[PDB]
# Entry
Amino acid sequence: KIVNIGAVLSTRKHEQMFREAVNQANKRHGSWKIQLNATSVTHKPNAIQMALSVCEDLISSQVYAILVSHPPTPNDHFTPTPVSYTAGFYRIPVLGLTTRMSIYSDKSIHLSFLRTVPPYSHQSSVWFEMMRVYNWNHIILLVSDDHEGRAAQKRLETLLEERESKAEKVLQFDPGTKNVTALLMEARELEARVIILSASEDDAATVYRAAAMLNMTGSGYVWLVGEREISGNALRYAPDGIIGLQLINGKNESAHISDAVGVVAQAVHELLEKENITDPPRGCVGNTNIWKTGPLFKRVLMSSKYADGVTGRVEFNEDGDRKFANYSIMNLQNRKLVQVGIYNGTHVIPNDRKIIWPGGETEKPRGYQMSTRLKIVTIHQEPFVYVKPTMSDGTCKEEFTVNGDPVKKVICTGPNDTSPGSPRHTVPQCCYGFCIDLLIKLARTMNFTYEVHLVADGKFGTQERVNNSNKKEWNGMMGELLSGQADMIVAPLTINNERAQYIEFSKPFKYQGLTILVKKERITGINDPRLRNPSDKFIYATVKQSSVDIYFRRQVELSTMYRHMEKHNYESAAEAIQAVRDNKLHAFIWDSAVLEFEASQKCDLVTTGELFFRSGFGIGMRKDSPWKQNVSLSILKSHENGFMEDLDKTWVR
Amino acid sequence: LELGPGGPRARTQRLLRQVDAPVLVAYCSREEAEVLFAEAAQAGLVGPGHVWLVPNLALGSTDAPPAAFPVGLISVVTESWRLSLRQKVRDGVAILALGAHSYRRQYGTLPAPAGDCRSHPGPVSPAREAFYRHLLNVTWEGRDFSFSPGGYLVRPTMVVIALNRHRLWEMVGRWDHGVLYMKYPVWPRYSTSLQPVVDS
Amino acid sequence: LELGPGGPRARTQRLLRQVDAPVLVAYCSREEAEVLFAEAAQAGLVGPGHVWLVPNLALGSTDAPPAAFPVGLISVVTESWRLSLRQKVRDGVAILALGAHSYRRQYGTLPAPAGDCRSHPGPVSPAREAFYRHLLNVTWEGRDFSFSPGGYLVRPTMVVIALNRHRLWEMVGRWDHGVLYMKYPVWPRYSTSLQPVVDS
Ligand SMILES: *[C@@H]1O[C@H](CO)[C@@H](O[C@@H]2O[C@H](CO)[C@@H](O[C@H]3O[C@H](CO)[C@@H](O)[C@H](O)[C@@H]3O)[C@H](O)[C@H]2NC(C)=O)[C@H](O)[C@H]1NC(C)=O
Ligand SMILES: *[C@@H]1O[C@H](CO)[C@@H](O[C@@H]2O[C@H](CO)[C@@H](O[C@H]3O[C@H](CO)[C@@H](O)[C@H](O)[C@@H]3O)[C@H](O)[C@H]2NC(C)=O)[C@H](O)[C@H]1NC(C)=O
Ligand SMILES: *[C@@H]1O[C@H](CO)[C@@H](O[C@@H]2O[C@H](CO)[C@@H](O)[C@H](O)[C@H]2NC(C)=O)[C@H](O)[C@H]1NC(C)=O
Ligand SMILES: *[C@@H]1O[C@H](CO)[C@@H](O[C@@H]2O[C@H](CO)[C@@H](O)[C@H](O)[C@H]2NC(C)=O)[C@H](O)[C@H]1NC(C)=O
Ligand SMILES: *[C@@H]1O[C@H](CO)[C@@H](O[C@@H]2O[C@H](CO)[C@@H](O)[C@H](O)[C@H]2NC(C)=O)[C@H](O)[C@H]1NC(C)=O
Ligand SMILES: *[C@@H]1O[C@H](CO)[C@@H](O[C@@H]2O[C@H](CO)[C@@H](O)[C@H](O)[C@H]2NC(C)=O)[C@H](O)[C@H]1NC(C)=O
Ligand SMILES: *[C@@H]1O[C@H](CO)[C@@H](O[C@@H]2O[C@H](CO)[C@@H](O)[C@H](O)[C@H]2NC(C)=O)[C@H](O)[C@H]1NC(C)=O
Ligand SMILES: *[C@@H]1O[C@H](CO)[C@@H](O[C@@H]2O[C@H](CO)[C@@H](O)[C@H](O)[C@H]2NC(C)=O)[C@H](O)[C@H]1NC(C)=O
Ligand SMILES: *[C@@H]1O[C@H](CO)[C@@H](O)[C@H](O)[C@H]1NC(C)=O
Ligand SMILES: *[C@@H]1O[C@H](CO)[C@@H](O)[C@H](O)[C@H]1NC(C)=O
Ligand SMILES: *[C@@H]1O[C@H](CO)[C@@H](O)[C@H](O)[C@H]1NC(C)=O
Ligand SMILES: *[C@@H]1O[C@H](CO)[C@@H](O)[C@H](O)[C@H]1NC(C)=O
# Structure
């Protein structure tokens, strides 16, 4: 039983190393009557003629596997593809020795393909490790629009989902296009200072020069790149201090040849010990069937641990890519690529030298640049945020408390009255109350200035699916905060599970629940028979697109009440309270604090039943906000000493 | 699961013995489909109370289905599934001709023919890129053949077919303009696997 | 599985690669145990995500566990597993002496000596049966040696032992009366040789 192996190499001397390696494997693994034969051909310029020569020289023989190298002249995925098709028709495994493209790891296209060197997509994983080492959470991902960039982005995002984190934003730029500065401009406006680039060498050079022109290479910024962006024309224009990484062997053709021959020999011996091995087709012409053993040979080849390689342990993952590779972390110090670590498959260990960050800093830079100007969206809630017209000269009227102390007020910008009568301009008005005083104390404590504006549509926020939409999106304050119009929500925003998935909440600054307001006390909460038996006689509803609507929608037992309420929901709390007082609405379901304050101050109305959904109000911020901890600590301290009690006495007695 | 010639027949029967569901959606090739359906019948997963839905990959040669395929198996194909080879060839040649017609009418000249197996130019010529663009969106005899950037069809008329009692693939539903049209108000379950009775 | 010495190995290796259970209970002799554990190591069922439990029969001399046995193998033995031969002989002679002493205390005479091989005493001779009954229920040094009518130890004090990292049969739990008292409130798991990996 003679076993024949084939190879497509470049220099015709690599063929001699291939023959020497096959001789070594044939002696180390007992020859007996196994006789591992070796045949080889050289790469050809024309791809079609290369495929035809693959049929005529290698497939014509009883080849069990084909090795394929990469010519020194850069042609990217062009050169190893033809073999992968011709050998892929018959399910003959083909091992790439130096190819790095991610398209060859897609087993639906390149069926019988394996590789001894990981693709570029795996450079994301090592990046992830650094994000764990230096605790970087807010990152920008600058990937090219080609398939390789998309693969890198997908791999990094999948890694981040396990950690349950997210990239700040992803910027896909068309390959080979100039003036990507516009995209970079967006990266400048973000709060993240870490940029992870995945592009070709020319695109890397373009991005480097554009970032240099925009002062993105200064202090506080961190650049993470792969080997494509720190070699060739990219290295010359690379800004100082960037961190790239290189595979240890990478371009060592001979080491990969030896390792591949070793793994192939081991797999061949195992396969012939398995019996029922049939025979390769012996010629492309005539034979139109796949090789029956092919899938079994590939399955044996993938499940192989050749822990004797020149390049270390040789093992494959679920799609043939080399698992557990070694990377060297390189830092550009004074126009020299100094090695400042090694990624040994699972961790990165710093060994020598000192990391020089792009701004010349000698200390680890944080991955964010929290601003001082804070755009704060707020809503008009009667005991928390009073909104009043300002006087003719553009300043708030001086007013003193009943105790005799000045009332702090802020200048908000809101939509004057409802939409039809509005002149459609953000008129400046005067905002004050519980939440405004809390915000003033919080800004004084945390040392940040602010500008306050009202929510455009006057809704707290919910998820809705408009017809002919590909996805649902938050409206109101939640949509404003998620879209970026606001940086922080200072309003009676209820904390619930639906909002918490997309939004970070501070520790509650006020505990309350849900209650029912009625005119003139004949309802026993939401367990009352009339509540569960709706009729046209009894009308009850809440404010549209609020926490109460979310609460009622998510309960199957309350579905009929949800339908009845939805048929008559109101636009705002004040309108529904007025409707209740005007005998137009019988019961109003809302927050305990607002409803209790309304009943106490206005009289003529009473709250009924016990609180049936206890929660609290919290300051809403974007996910993984750097100062979420500081806001929570400040709120806890305010609760502890006296501040919340003082606010309660002053505003809502 | 794991299908294929012979293979490890165990551990697929064990897994198919713990499938408790009224509706099953399967993905496999033709031979793997036959193996899976033989295993499922051995595991009592066919008959009334079980509905199978598969894409076109599992089907092969719609003219003659295997004996292992259960009746009531549901798949979705394109409208040209019932057309003859001559009609398919005519439709494809019509697509090419209409694309050439639109390109000539908009540019004022016939498109340049293709090259050879010789040295390839490299960068794509603007003429080749424009002919491709006019070749994508083509409508012919009412039904449109708009092509995706990925090279497949966008918004085609789709036909939901199912295997009837007579072991023949027959049309059951239509999908035009994003609106389903089914011929059965309630899904018929006339399979004759009531030997255990409890199976239903 | 056959688990015979030097026989069909591919047949059992095929089935051992299809097992997905995280806890495996085995029953075999010592040699079959070694063969089974070797094949399981070849099939990757020995790692930190697999627990093997076997009765006394599978193991042999606990003083020298074989190399094929994985760490964390669990078995249950009697409380005399760590006793020397002299101590066990003393316990047995004590049981016989206490039975004879009870029989004499009730009947006022020592039990009659046993017969001979060159005869067959067809009747049970209730003098013998009474002595057997007295031999059944015996307590000694605060240990219950009560014997079942099936002639084996009933309600005995059992201990649960396991093979630790140093490849020694360490004691883990006790079976005092009908209550389990075992160390290790969380079961420790080792990655093959070392590195006591912790569950995530
Ligand atoms: C790819 O990696 C190969 C091994 O990792 C490497 O082969 C090695 O080549 C070196 C010389 O470049 C040989 O070392 C020779 O010279 C030293 C110094 O005197 C002697 O100590 C050695 O005995 C020897 O004469 C290594 O022996 C050789 N190792 C092997 C296993 O081949 C290739 O050079 C690398 N190819 C590249 C980097 O392109
Ligand atoms: C949340 O509150 C934290 C405590 O007030 C605060 O940590 C403090 O951060 C400042 C930096 O602004 C540190 O000041 C040190 O660093 C600066 C700049 O590097 C130096 O100029 C100073 O001389 C000083 O060495 C404080 O030391 C540090 N306090 C503690 C206790 O660690 C956080 O920054 C706050 N979070 C925010 C604002 O998002
Ligand atoms: C063993 O491999 C050698 C290649 O080293 C094969 O010899 C080639 O055979 C083909 C077809 O007969 C010729 O086109 C080549 O010119 C030969 N190469 C050399 C260097 O002579 C040989 O056929 C193989 N033997 C077996 C039994 O497969
Ligand atoms: C590349 O893009 C940049 C940024 O969009 C262009 O620079 C702008 O060009 C417009 C003219 O359309 C002018 O407003 C200014 O010259 C630039 N404005 C800003 C805000 O940058 C540039 O013209 C584009 N083309 C190149 C660089 O060749
Ligand atoms: C990455 O490189 C390190 C060396 O820096 C490799 O570690 C050595 O690998 C050889 C090869 O088997 C062993 O003989 C040594 O004992 C290893 N040394 C140490 C300290 O572990 C490592 O194997 C390489 N990565 C891979 C996946 O092989
Ligand atoms: C509150 O913030 C202001 C400005 O944001 C700080 O004023 C300057 O902050 C920079 C930031 O490092 C310092 O370098 C300057 O020295 C500060 N100015 C002065 C006059 O000291 C201010 O220090 C902050 N207050 C704190 C941190 O307590
Ligand atoms: C099919 O698509 C092509 C490509 O968009 C259309 O060609 C365009 O025709 C308009 C005139 O109506 C020109 O202004 C565009 O420049 C053409 N595009 C290109 C890329 O040349 C063509 O009209 C479409 N066919 C139909 C029937 O609408
Ligand atoms: C062990 O069991 C034997 C057999 O039941 C007990 O012997 C009996 O003792 C009672 C007590 O007076 C007598 O009435 C019976 O006649 C005895 N039967 C026989 C067959 O001897 C003995 O007492 C038990 N020992 C203990 C410690 O409980
Ligand atoms: C970048 O920094 C230089 C340094 O002086 C400055 O002149 C230039 O205006 C900066 N570019 C900006 C702010 O866009
Ligand atoms: C090997 O092939 C023979 C004939 O093709 C067949 O009878 C036998 O079952 C096969 N052995 C396997 C599948 O283990
Ligand atoms: C705001 O709206 C009121 C209507 O109540 C109007 O009287 C006032 O002039 C408006 N303010 C403007 C347009 O600045
Ligand atoms: C779908 O949404 C559009 C958006 O304006 C609307 O005009 C149309 O009437 C909607 N169709 C419905 C509700 O059937």
